Amino acid sequence: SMEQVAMELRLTELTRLLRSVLDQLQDKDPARIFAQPVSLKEVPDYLDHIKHPMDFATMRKRLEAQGYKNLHEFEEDFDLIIDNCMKYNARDTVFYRAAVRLRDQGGVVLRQARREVDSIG
Numbered sequence: 001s002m003e004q005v006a007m008e009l010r011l012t013e014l015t016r017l018l019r020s021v022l023d024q025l026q027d028k029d030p031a032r033i034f035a036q037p038v039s040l041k042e043v044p045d046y047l048d049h050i051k052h053p054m055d056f057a058t059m060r061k062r063l064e065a066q067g068y069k070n071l072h073e074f075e076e077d078f079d080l081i082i083d084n085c086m087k088y089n090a091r092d093t094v095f096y097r098a099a100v101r102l103r104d105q106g107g108v109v110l111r112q113a114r115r116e117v118d119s120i121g
């Protein structure tokens with residue numbers, strides 16, 4: 001149908017916008033602490049601590065299969081990255097501090113994206 005194609009043109013454009021948002025968020029992690037999943041070879045107890053791991057590369061695979069239906073879903077995955085890190089690592093670590101910074105710098109980009117998704121559809 002023609003409705004199905006229009007729905008898909010919108011999913012496609014949401015995906016173009018989220019790819020831009022992803023790049024902006026990742027630029028706020030110059031250290032690359034959140035680029036890849038936590039290694040189970042290197043932290044074999046990790047899944048005892050964190051039930052839903054997340055990282056930028058996993059978000060990117062989902063993004064490119066157009067698996068984000070809306071911005072809420074995307075934001076949930078971004079928050080897992082931050083929130084997982086702040087639980088696993090103690091306050092006085094480079095990892096915890098890197099998450100705090102990504103959250104704060106993330107908040108601006110996400111504030112504007114919610115306006116662009118509301119505005120443009």
Ligand code: NA
Pocket residue numbers: 086087088089090
């Ligand atoms: Na903790």
